[PDB]
Amino acid sequence: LQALHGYYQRMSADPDAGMPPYLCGQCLITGERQKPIAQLHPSIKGGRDGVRGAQAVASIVSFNNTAFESYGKEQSINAPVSQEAAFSYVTALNYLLNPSNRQKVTIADATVVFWAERSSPAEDIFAGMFDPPRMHDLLVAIRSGKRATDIMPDMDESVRFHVLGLSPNAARLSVRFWEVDTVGHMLDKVGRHYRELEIIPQFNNEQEFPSLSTLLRQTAVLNKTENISPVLAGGLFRAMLTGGPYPQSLLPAVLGRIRAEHARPEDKSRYRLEVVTYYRAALIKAYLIRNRKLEVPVSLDPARTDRPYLLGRLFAVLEKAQEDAVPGANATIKDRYLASASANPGQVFHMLLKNASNHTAKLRKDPERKAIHYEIMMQEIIDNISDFPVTMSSDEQGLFMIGYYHQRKALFTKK
Amino acid sequence: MTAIANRYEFVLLFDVENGNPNGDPDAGNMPRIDPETGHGLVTDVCLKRKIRNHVALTKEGAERFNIYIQEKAILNETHERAYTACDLKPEPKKLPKKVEDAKRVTDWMCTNFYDIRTFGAVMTTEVNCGQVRGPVQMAFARSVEPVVPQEVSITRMAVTTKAEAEDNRTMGRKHIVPYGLYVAHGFISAPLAEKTGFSDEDLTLFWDALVNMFEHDRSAARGLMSSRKLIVFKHQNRLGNAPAHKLFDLVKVSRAEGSSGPARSFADYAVTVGQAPEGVEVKEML
Amino acid sequence: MTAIANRYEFVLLFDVENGNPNGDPDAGNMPRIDPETGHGLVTDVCLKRKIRNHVALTKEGAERFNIYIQEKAILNETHERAYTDAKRVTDWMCTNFYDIRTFGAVMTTEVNCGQVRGPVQMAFARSVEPVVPQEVSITRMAVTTKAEAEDNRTMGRKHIVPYGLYVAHGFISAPLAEKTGFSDEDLTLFWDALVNMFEHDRSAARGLMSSRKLIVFKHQNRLGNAPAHKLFDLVKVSRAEGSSGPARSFADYAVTVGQAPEGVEVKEML
Amino acid sequence: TYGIRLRVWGDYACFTRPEMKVERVSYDVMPPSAARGILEAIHWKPAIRWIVDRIHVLRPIVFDNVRRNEVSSKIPKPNPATAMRDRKPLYFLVDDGSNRQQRAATLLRNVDYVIEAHFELTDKAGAEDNAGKHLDIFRRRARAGQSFQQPCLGCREFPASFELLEGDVPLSCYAGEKRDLGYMLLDIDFERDMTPLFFKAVMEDGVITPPSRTSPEVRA
């Protein structure tokens, strides 16, 4: 890994972050010939301070067991490097991991670090802007599409930028992803990422530039910081800064969550928590863009005219009836039928409708007789439809939730 | 307790009427279903619990007839008892090793406890006692036809807590299945039994348990449930003579030609059993 | 030592129902899935394990069918030992250990560069179409430690595949076998092991699994007679005509094999 | 003219970096050593040598993650005579304690290469040997699809489909871009007690040209 060695060389001539301490073969990292070869390397800081979740003492290269040794050579001789190179290598890394200096962040399973090839403000900007808590004027600039220099011309977009993500197991250490792009390209892709995510907020207090750590949590079994699949954490981070497709595994993960969810009076929230949260909708929208190349709006589209999207709207309205009928409701059709209806419509919708009648009927006997307004809407929606489909493919099952989220919001805007 | 000397397989059928066979902890408390097809589901775990209960009831704790996964128990105490009865004291929570007399503490637990002897148990918890597999296995149960669960709204004329905030009634609800018919599969293997001592007497007990387990299970939410058929295949040697799926194909279930509309009784269906290959013999218990 | 005299390639089909075929150490315990395609994935060591197990169980320490690698299925009994310049030792072990004779292994010390490779080779197995796992919540009526006791109950998790069909490829090299003595009787036993490998695998997690079809390509010459990657195309699997919506049974699919070149023979054992 | 062009592709590949042997991480691209290893899988005799000249990269770069269960140690040498002179069982128990090891892997997902190499006689060769005859044998086998064993992309669990090219090299994904790799493994010196060698790697037009590994100056 040239990067670390060069980093240390860069600033070791400076009065900080570098200290002078420290057969014959070819030094791999430097490529030089006939230099002493180290038999073992200095240790790496573990623990909370160092790599979170690791052993107190950790290493990158180790050959403890016979199964790990090849061509009859032992210990670190399996990978020759000079003593000074190993020292500087380790030193740099150690320095970086220091929380005292703003160059570290934690994401689910893994700790991430970054640096610039040359001294630049980029380092500063990235630390917060990749996972939000000038602040956001440059964020709306990259989301809009304009170049970074526009807001800050000083930024030499030609400067190189490094990123590294590590995760541990016992005393041994692993690598999940690594990236080396330039400034210019790098935040261009980050801008693109934000565009896709854009959704109308459900409440005024919600995030506008959602933090990546926020989003991952939402997929957890019980919203716990653990229970996050280490594979999705690695996949989404690489997909963000490389600009490639999202991993295929992502969508059924989300849908699973929505199936498994139920309200939690035990948490004693004033509102009965929504199943299709602000965050979850955002993830679904983004996936349909890159992967499926669909068109989907930022807000409610009354002219969409698609069976999956229509049926999502329909479910919203008929839910509203229930809510009004029984203030302070026990459970709602959201808590039980939402998984069935979105996968297999023709088996459930028949009865759903029937129920709705009673709600309407009761709302019609009391004062405040605008069951009427809901009754019209149903009619309108229905007309566009020919038949209920028996089954829907996953791609059909995103659109249904988007139609529901948009239509439900539409009604909140009233009340 | 000598081990059995043949391979076995079996099929089971049972009904439900105006009841909830197994509540889902996530779906409020609706019956479990396949979201994509509407078919019903039952966990093997349920069946196992039923069996354990029946055994307990019938035997009343006779020697070698205790059950281990028992109401509100702290499990590691039984491991420490097994260790102590084997004259020894346990290792710490890491336990990457075997216990200090693996044979005696495992055999101590195998001997005394019936359900361990039958099913096995994960037991490398903080008091180690080793690990067991168990010779008897079974899979999920699936309804032959889609089901239509429905909800019922009910009242109570009294309240529990003094915070009445108003002396008044109280609402509630129920979930039921009008009717449904289920199928299940299971296996038994001699080599495993050899390792545990699973003996023929156990097997007869097992059959009886299967036949009658439901009868002692009445409750508010259950409704009416009962077993209807039971077919057992016996191989003629220590290792089988035909693939399992082939045998399960000999049993066929179809609606009686005269019936129409939604099914409502076991009379709506017809069941048929074919002819087994020479290496197997078919017998019907019930 | 006498050995097979023809190259071989084979294809196998098997399915699962309400079970977990291969868990993921990484992603909690979810079944493996391909991020690229959404297809299910099963590694090959998982199958080699099974094969070893079945052979050990069937043969019960016959003269030349001992197995080296164990998982505490081991048993205590008398064992035969046929007797047989470390080449002498290498031959000796290869004579009476089957798994080494078929797959090969690595020793602790080498006089110089040298390998024991073995004639059999395999690859990953993948689904025919996308799969979506189910999630199951369960309860337990009891607790492990005295500490957690404070009525003494807890939740749990299960992962299941409603249904799935899998394919796998494999190769056999005659020239390698000639350096190990792998002979025909071994090949017949190998076919049998492939057919019946799942019949002793029953557990809590796996549900029901079984093999369905097995096609064998037998080459005319000591070396092959056609490119392997084109033979695998002759096999084609597609949904039955009437079948619609999610698959739930082997009857939902249709399988066909085209006509093979002149120099090879196509056999079906399942 | 002289030499050969061969094409190979597959779904999986892994060229383990020497440093990350325990926690496998693959090179960005195939190294020459694996290229030589593959060629000898089609045809080789003690009387000849292989020399690699160039590699063509035809597809973009992609990475994916995998995890597995593994073993910690190798099997020791036994003593036959004592074995039946005193009958004892022999085995390695996988499941027991520290024997069990878990290893991760980062690997490539979609690859395609064309490699240019030629032929050479070695000192051991007898007078009757000729490079052309072996080259023709290689051509025949490659056309027929025959082989001594199935080739692999690094590890045996990754088979490779191969073809013989009789025409022009197609274009490449980064045909108009240049890239830097740093130092990479050139080859391993078996004759001087298994000593590795390293060289500087650079990619432009998706073609990489290593120096000749037989050259003495590289052996320093």
PDB file of N, CA, C and O in Angstrom, chain D residues 67-87:
ATOM      1  N   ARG D  67     -17.400 -15.064   2.603  1.00  0.00           N
ATOM      2  CA  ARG D  67     -16.955 -15.599   3.830  1.00  0.00           C
ATOM      3  C   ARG D  67     -17.136 -17.087   3.927  1.00  0.00           C
ATOM      4  O   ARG D  67     -18.120 -17.594   3.385  1.00  0.00           O
ATOM      5  N   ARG D  68     -16.302 -17.823   4.581  1.00  0.00           N
ATOM      6  CA  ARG D  68     -16.256 -19.230   4.672  1.00  0.00           C
ATOM      7  C   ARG D  68     -15.629 -19.770   5.928  1.00  0.00           C
ATOM      8  O   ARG D  68     -14.865 -19.064   6.588  1.00  0.00           O
ATOM      9  N   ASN D  69     -15.867 -20.990   6.278  1.00  0.00           N
ATOM     10  CA  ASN D  69     -15.305 -21.780   7.305  1.00  0.00           C
ATOM     11  C   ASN D  69     -14.100 -22.537   6.817  1.00  0.00           C
ATOM     12  O   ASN D  69     -14.169 -23.104   5.724  1.00  0.00           O
ATOM     13  N   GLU D  70     -13.024 -22.617   7.524  1.00  0.00           N
ATOM     14  CA  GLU D  70     -11.801 -23.225   7.167  1.00  0.00           C
ATOM     15  C   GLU D  70     -11.047 -23.928   8.265  1.00  0.00           C
ATOM     16  O   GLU D  70     -11.486 -23.907   9.418  1.00  0.00           O
ATOM     17  N   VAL D  71      -9.927 -24.514   8.009  1.00  0.00           N
ATOM     18  CA  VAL D  71      -9.073 -25.302   8.814  1.00  0.00           C
ATOM     19  C   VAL D  71      -7.805 -24.564   9.140  1.00  0.00           C
ATOM     20  O   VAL D  71      -7.436 -23.654   8.391  1.00  0.00           O
ATOM     21  N   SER D  72      -7.095 -24.882  10.175  1.00  0.00           N
ATOM     22  CA  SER D  72      -5.972 -24.223  10.721  1.00  0.00           C
ATOM     23  C   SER D  72      -4.619 -24.841  10.482  1.00  0.00           C
ATOM     24  O   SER D  72      -3.594 -24.171  10.639  1.00  0.00           O
ATOM     25  N   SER D  73      -4.508 -26.085  10.162  1.00  0.00           N
ATOM     26  CA  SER D  73      -3.323 -26.845  10.100  1.00  0.00           C
ATOM     27  C   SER D  73      -3.332 -27.962   9.093  1.00  0.00           C
ATOM     28  O   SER D  73      -4.403 -28.432   8.706  1.00  0.00           O
ATOM     29  N   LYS D  74      -2.144 -28.412   8.694  1.00  0.00           N
ATOM     30  CA  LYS D  74      -1.991 -29.498   7.740  1.00  0.00           C
ATOM     31  C   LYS D  74      -1.814 -30.828   8.467  1.00  0.00           C
ATOM     32  O   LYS D  74      -1.630 -30.880   9.685  1.00  0.00           O
ATOM     33  N   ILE D  75      -1.860 -31.915   7.776  1.00  0.00           N
ATOM     34  CA  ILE D  75      -1.763 -33.259   8.211  1.00  0.00           C
ATOM     35  C   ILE D  75      -0.328 -33.695   8.345  1.00  0.00           C
ATOM     36  O   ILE D  75       0.445 -33.431   7.413  1.00  0.00           O
ATOM     37  N   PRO D  76       0.092 -34.363   9.416  1.00  0.00           N
ATOM     38  CA  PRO D  76       1.490 -34.782   9.527  1.00  0.00           C
ATOM     39  C   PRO D  76       1.765 -36.091   8.805  1.00  0.00           C
ATOM     40  O   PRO D  76       0.856 -36.854   8.474  1.00  0.00           O
ATOM     41  N   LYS D  77       3.046 -36.340   8.572  1.00  0.00           N
ATOM     42  CA  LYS D  77       3.482 -37.566   7.918  1.00  0.00           C
ATOM     43  C   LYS D  77       3.277 -38.757   8.848  1.00  0.00           C
ATOM     44  O   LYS D  77       3.712 -38.705  10.008  1.00  0.00           O
ATOM     45  N   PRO D  78       2.634 -39.831   8.402  1.00  0.00           N
ATOM     46  CA  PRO D  78       2.463 -41.006   9.257  1.00  0.00           C
ATOM     47  C   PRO D  78       3.586 -42.015   9.064  1.00  0.00           C
ATOM     48  O   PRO D  78       4.442 -41.883   8.188  1.00  0.00           O
ATOM     49  N   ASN D  79       3.562 -43.046   9.909  1.00  0.00           N
ATOM     50  CA  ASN D  79       4.479 -44.173   9.797  1.00  0.00           C
ATOM     51  C   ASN D  79       3.683 -45.436   9.507  1.00  0.00           C
ATOM     52  O   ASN D  79       2.952 -45.907  10.392  1.00  0.00           O
ATOM     53  N   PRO D  80       3.780 -46.020   8.311  1.00  0.00           N
ATOM     54  CA  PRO D  80       2.931 -47.187   8.016  1.00  0.00           C
ATOM     55  C   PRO D  80       3.144 -48.344   8.975  1.00  0.00           C
ATOM     56  O   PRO D  80       2.192 -48.788   9.628  1.00  0.00           O
ATOM     57  N   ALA D  81       4.381 -48.831   9.099  1.00  0.00           N
ATOM     58  CA  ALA D  81       4.621 -50.084   9.809  1.00  0.00           C
ATOM     59  C   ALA D  81       3.998 -50.063  11.200  1.00  0.00           C
ATOM     60  O   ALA D  81       3.330 -51.020  11.608  1.00  0.00           O
ATOM     61  N   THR D  82       4.210 -48.979  11.946  1.00  0.00           N
ATOM     62  CA  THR D  82       3.611 -48.877  13.271  1.00  0.00           C
ATOM     63  C   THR D  82       2.091 -48.908  13.192  1.00  0.00           C
ATOM     64  O   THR D  82       1.421 -49.337  14.137  1.00  0.00           O
ATOM     65  N   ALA D  83       1.526 -48.461  12.069  1.00  0.00           N
ATOM     66  CA  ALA D  83       0.075 -48.353  11.967  1.00  0.00           C
ATOM     67  C   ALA D  83      -0.623 -49.692  12.151  1.00  0.00           C
ATOM     68  O   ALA D  83      -1.532 -49.786  12.982  1.00  0.00           O
ATOM     69  N   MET D  84      -0.224 -50.731  11.411  1.00  0.00           N
ATOM     70  CA  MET D  84      -0.801 -52.053  11.608  1.00  0.00           C
ATOM     71  C   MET D  84      -0.026 -52.923  12.586  1.00  0.00           C
ATOM     72  O   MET D  84      -0.598 -53.886  13.103  1.00  0.00           O
ATOM     73  N   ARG D  85       1.244 -52.617  12.860  1.00  0.00           N
ATOM     74  CA  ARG D  85       1.920 -53.305  13.955  1.00  0.00           C
ATOM     75  C   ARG D  85       1.234 -53.014  15.280  1.00  0.00           C
ATOM     76  O   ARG D  85       1.334 -53.806  16.223  1.00  0.00           O
ATOM     77  N   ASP D  86       0.537 -51.883  15.366  1.00  0.00           N
ATOM     78  CA  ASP D  86      -0.318 -51.552  16.504  1.00  0.00           C
ATOM     79  C   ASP D  86      -1.494 -50.770  15.929  1.00  0.00           C
ATOM     80  O   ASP D  86      -1.358 -49.589  15.595  1.00  0.00           O
ATOM     81  N   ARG D  87      -2.638 -51.435  15.804  1.00  0.00           N
ATOM     82  CA  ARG D  87      -3.770 -50.857  15.092  1.00  0.00           C
ATOM     83  C   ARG D  87      -4.337 -49.671  15.861  1.00  0.00           C
ATOM     84  O   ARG D  87      -4.837 -49.826  16.979  1.00  0.00           O
TER      85      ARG D  87
END
